[PDB]
């Protein structure tokens, strides 16, 4: 296969949050068939970021999803041609982000180019005041439509002091060639910041992603 | 406990869909601690319904949810005082439903009073043209806030011909007394129409609901 049991990846992300421009570069690695992966990011421009790092962590790698053999793996099949993805994040306090990615492969390394646009975060909310403490483990609902893989996820950020800050994700994955489409299924993830420097200009993330059928069916 | 291992329930539902008034009555039974239940519904007024039965099936019983001992069971704890619930269903073609319930107990029988308001279903859409073929097995994201249990679910109806028709649920459960609040968790459900007459004026449904912690955590 063009996707080896061990792979690396590079992340090039740029964008704005409430008008604040930034750039990030990442170097990641993982086991695509085990759904295990890690990434080390550096804020290369606009740092230190005046907003919660957590809104950016889910934008830094779908080939690293363990798919059981009886569920077609849309993203792994798209290679070597690759795929793109388009995400809408609707936060419960009215903030909205639109994120686009282009994913390609160069030997044993995936290349992700990401554009992030976030705005309408309340200036005294938990994202601009950096009161978030990571995403809860989550489940993306996935199904096939018009040759694209459509995902939806009721996400939630944990807050300093308790409580949750809700965010709805809508992600559409678009393979650059036709592939075998999967049935209606889910992907469970855990995403954690495992290390960071004082001002989050260097961050390390670990993510485990596993596809499955419904538990009760 | 006030909730026995085998219980019955009665449903009294009324409402409108694109201005069409109806009433439904149901007789149900199940094993609350096993998350198993079945209900028989009869359209008592405004039948045959000119819209898909499927939009009404999730309005006909949260006490019948299997909760592990280490996850507080918000709804079972609310009894004998009981609880209410409020639901918003946003369909992808712009249709919206608001549903309210009052749930009480009389001995070994729960009593559900439901009010349904649905509108903006396109006249040539799958609900008004009766092209739906049941709900996909699904997962409700649940968490506690201000003494209420908040649920969200990315639901989908199967369509005649193979597609899906998406619906977002937001359900708020409100106990009539304070109860021990659970942590962030999920409920998996399968909901099926197991029998019906030609015009869906008599319908039988089976539902299995099981609470759990995230699969990947
Ligand atoms: Br670091
Ligand atoms: Cl398709
Ligand atoms: Cl609470």
Residue numbers in the entry:
A (entry chain C), B (entry chain A): 2 to 61, 65 to 221
Extract from the study:
Anthozoan chromoproteins are highly pigmented, diversely coloured and readily produced in recombinant expression systems. Here, high-resolution X-ray crystal structures of four open-source chromoproteins, gfasPurple, amilCP, spisPink and eforRed, are presented. Like GFP, chromoprotein monomers have a β-barrel structure that contains a chromophore, which is autocatalytically constructed from adjacent X–tyrosine–glycine residues encoded within the protein sequence itself.
The structure of amilCP has eight molecules in the asymmetric unit, with four of them in the same tetrameric arrangement and the other four forming a second tetramer within crystallographic symmetry. GfasPurple and amilCP have the same chromophore composition (Gln62-Tyr63-Gly64), while the chromophore is composed of Met62-Tyr63-Gly64 in eforRed and Lys66-Tyr67-Gly68 in spisPink. Previous work has confirmed that S175T and S61C mutations alone are sufficient to shift the colour of gfasPurple to be the same as that of amilCP. The glutamyl moieties in amilCP and gfasPurple are sandwiched between two glutamine residues (Gln38 and Gln209), and this is also the case for the methionyl moiety in eforRed (Gln38 and Gln211). Similar water channels are present in gfasPurple and amilCP, stretching between the chromophore-interacting Met159 residues. In these two proteins, the water molecules also hydrogen-bond to four tyrosine residues (Tyr188 and Tyr190), as well as the protein backbone, aiding the stability of the remaining imperfectly packed hydrophobic residues within the interface. The same hydrophobic residue from each chain is at the very centre; the Phe158 residues in gfasPurple and amilCP form π–π interactions with each other, while the two Ala190 and Ile162 residues in eforRed and spisPink, respectively, form hydrophobic interactions.
